[PDB]
Amino acid sequence: PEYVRVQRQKKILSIRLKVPPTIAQFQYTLDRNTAAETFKLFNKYRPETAAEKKERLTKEAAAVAEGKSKQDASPKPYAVKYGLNHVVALIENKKAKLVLIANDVDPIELVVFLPALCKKMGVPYAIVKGKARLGTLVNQKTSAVAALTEVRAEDEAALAKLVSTIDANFADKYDEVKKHWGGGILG
Amino acid sequence: GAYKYLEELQRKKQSDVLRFLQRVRVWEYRQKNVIHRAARPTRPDKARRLGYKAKQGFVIYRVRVRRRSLRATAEERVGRRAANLRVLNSYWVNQDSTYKYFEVILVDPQHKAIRRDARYNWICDPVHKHREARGLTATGKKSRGINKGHKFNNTKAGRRKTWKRQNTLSLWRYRK
């Protein structure tokens, strides 16, 4: 076929040529156990689905329909944040405690400023592998970004050690090789 | 929002990362057809300021033209190909010595999202048939040269119009 031929010829012409160092920061990404614990963290903070939302809405609406106005109390919803402009919006306050960044986006240029932007804003970013795995934890097909701001007190101590873990595993390991021109070796 | 980043990064075209992406994508599109359907705008901010929305009834074609203008001919190709679609607009993405690449937003007036949603229902009007064929698009109005200014004078088609002004004579019932 043609499309199989092109998708195999793709990633050959990339690595054969010199990639700029603002790329290939991607795939210098998080290792196995740390990404695993990051997913264990963010599955604790799944956002509400449309079905669960509408279900709670029907519950409270049937409550008010009886009326049976039970109380007026709810702390806040805490969830991951996943809209890209919303993720950037949570930076430049700053509010992002952790950011996950997908390596694979076909318009890469949507994403390329985010490591430098969280670098200058001091936000603990981490480059995650695969936007589908982001979409799974956020009930989308893909997400390509994952910001997290608000955390319960049960999880806040896990958050800080995860931040220190990432800054040890990502910011220390890959920082100098981030500056280097990747690829260029023929296929 | 992140669009300001994309615009300011987009203004630096011969910068290393953008020419890298450009050089990959020109070969990648060279693999494909002259005209095909793109899944998404490669320059989303430019598509927004040309009027793209991400919903059903918005079709993005990527079109290849050999080096009228090149942009308007690129619009005419996808206007001829997808006749049911109405051409919203178009923009440059990429070029080679052999070909320039354009990314064209077309809008379907048949989809009920477009037939409702009164920001865009005007394009369902049959006066908006084939705007590129009459040069009613943005590049069409530029090549027609229709603005306000003394720099804008009688040019080509309007020249025949004012030739028409010299060609016809006006007489009243009572001669003046």
Add this chain to the structure above:
Amino acid sequence: RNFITRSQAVRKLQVSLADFRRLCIFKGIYPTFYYAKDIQYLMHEPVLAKFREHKTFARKLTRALGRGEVSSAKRLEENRDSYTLDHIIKERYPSFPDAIRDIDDALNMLFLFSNLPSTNQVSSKIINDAQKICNQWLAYVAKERLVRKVFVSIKGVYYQANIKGEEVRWLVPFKFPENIPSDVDFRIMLTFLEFYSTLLHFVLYKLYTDSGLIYPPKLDLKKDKIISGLSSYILESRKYDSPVASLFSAFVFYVSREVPIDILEFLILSCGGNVISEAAMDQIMSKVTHQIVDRPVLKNKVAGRTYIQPQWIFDCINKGELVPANKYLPGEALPPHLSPW
């Protein structure tokens, strides 16, 4: 055009082949050489559509699991339609005596599955529904008390019931743990099971409403804790044909703990007499006249109580009449019983 290859038909119907095997057995579609017009009849069927919908449903279940979203999978499973079997049962058997004619094979499988132990491939819920429907079927027989024929064998217990026309020849194998055969495939017998289950289900509906009582049969739970049988069910309200129904009228038995309780219990219920077993008693004897027992040495040896080996019941109902019990007295030898077939 008369013969169609199974691959051709299964790709024209766009169904999986195992589900095509379901549908052929399920509608009674018979031959890799199949009638074109029968497949044309099969070509539109909502159960086929719900099968394809179940395929897509399981695909959406797989993406629900692979995304890990448990609650949406719960919503999918709860908001799920079930294909029923019932319409082609009625348009397959419109005339109810044809269902009475073809209930005969339908009983036999369900009784065998009611005997069968719980496995992985056959769910217990399957076996639960089987044992429930089979106990219902036996409890209906003990209402009118109308069978006539009895057969004792190394292969099964063949009873045919004289009910609304034909005598119906159902068999129960004894309640023994069976070594499962690895040679068989359940995937066919489960389809037969479900088809016969739904068919016999609606036939039990017409037989319970036609007998004028409530189609769901209530049971006392502690009566079921005594014994899981037809005698667990109580049967509500909203003569007997001579002699076999109300044979042994006003007759009080004392079945032992030694005897097989089940088929003798059902025979006494076909008689209308009472059942008293000491096996039921130790869960926790004024009118008892007769012991059904098969033991060499009888302990208390009450001369008032009659001591009988159970073939007397097997021979009296095969004759419809009373016989002397000197042969059936332990430990006298027995006539080699050859049943009326």
Add this chain to the structure above:
Amino acid sequence: KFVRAESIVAKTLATSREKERIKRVSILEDKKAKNETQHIASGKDFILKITEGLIREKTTYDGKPALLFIVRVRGPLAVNIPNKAFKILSLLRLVETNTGVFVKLTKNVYPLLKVIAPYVVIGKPSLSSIRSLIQKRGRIIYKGENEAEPHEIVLNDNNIVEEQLGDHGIICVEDIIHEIATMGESFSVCNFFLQPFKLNREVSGFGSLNRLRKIKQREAESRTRQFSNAATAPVIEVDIDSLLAKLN
């Protein structure tokens, strides 16, 4: 294989918890049996009964021989099973899980129930349930015609039964049901005779649909089974009439 770094820690922590509760059970039961109740929690024992948040009623223990049916549960999450409980499950033949057995309950029997509580499930059985188990399941290890003889045979021949049980005069496996329910003359004859039990797994598992069943059952088991680790743990009893509807 490279196993992992985490499982080796979790097993150690879980074995620490289990050895601690087992030592607590052993010390408390030694002080009870030696009758030196001076500074302990409680003197007399208790029994939980979960029926249908669902109603959980407690009784004091009655020093009366009660027929129980035990059902081996898969133990807790990552636990190495300790050798004290391994000894008891070895005696009671409860390894190779989904495996129950009928047992006699006395006050000498009772202290081990507090020990092996996180690995089995208990309750009051019914005669129909015992009947169904024996008429549908059960194999006997058997010395046959000409065998290498690790040889097991399903329960069909009552004459094989009255062969090896003629000294007690026990015939006709219905009577074995009757005397397991009865326990008037001899239960333990039948108990050593019926020596293996096997129950199927309730859910087939691997496949799209049955994983839902597995998750719902893990949630149900989390609701039902309770792990006190107090050494004054009330003995949890469940409806085996409900349980064998699932597993048989």
Add this chain to the structure above:
RNA sequence: GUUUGACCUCAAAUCAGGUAGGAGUACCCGCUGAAAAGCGGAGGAAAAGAAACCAACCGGGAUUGCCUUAGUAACGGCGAGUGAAGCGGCAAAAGCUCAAAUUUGAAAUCUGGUACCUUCGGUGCCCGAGUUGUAAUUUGGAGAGGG
């Protein structure tokens, strides 16, 4: 884990629903073009149209068309002749919408299918689309947050 699944891409559908073509063509709009023809595209009009305008004033104020500017300015072997525009008077008058900073205390948005209903649609349910952004709010004449 040699398994399973997310995606993403690309195919296939006698799948569902839609749509393009051709004729005519006085007027309109584009393209090509000689000594007009031709091509393409529409509508009852079309186009243009709400200043990156005109002015130099005591400033004017979207576009369109008429009268005047005016056969003037300007151009042109400054030969043949070519040939405007501002202002003024009038007709008609109408202004609006996006794209930029978050709703993040809950995508609030919509197509489609189905069941009903008062059907150029409505309600419910369910698939989907969509965070690589659909809604509300804001287009400088500001506007937003609050009070």
